[PDB]
């Protein structure tokens, strides 16, 4: 008969870089 | 005969942290 | 008698998008 299923595949690739952070604080007075 | 392929693998690693945000607004006059 | 196990499965999905970056630098002098 057919053999059992193989194991799970390898992990996928790394995700996309995250979004830019928020704007910085106001500058000096 | 050989069995079927295994299931798809797990999701890949999370993406890198995003870059720094844009510069902040000008300081007060 | 039983056949051999199948091959490994396909690669998984791409990972999640990363977290937001840090705040930007201070703005220009006023």
């Amino acid at each position: 008969p057919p053999g059992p299923p193989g194991p799970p595949g390898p992990p996928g690739p790394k995700g996309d870089q995250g979004p830019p952070g928020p704007p910085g604080p106001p500058g000096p007075p």
Side-chain angles (χ1 to χ4, degrees), chain A:
Chain A
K14 183 173 170 180
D16 292 345
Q17 176 184 94

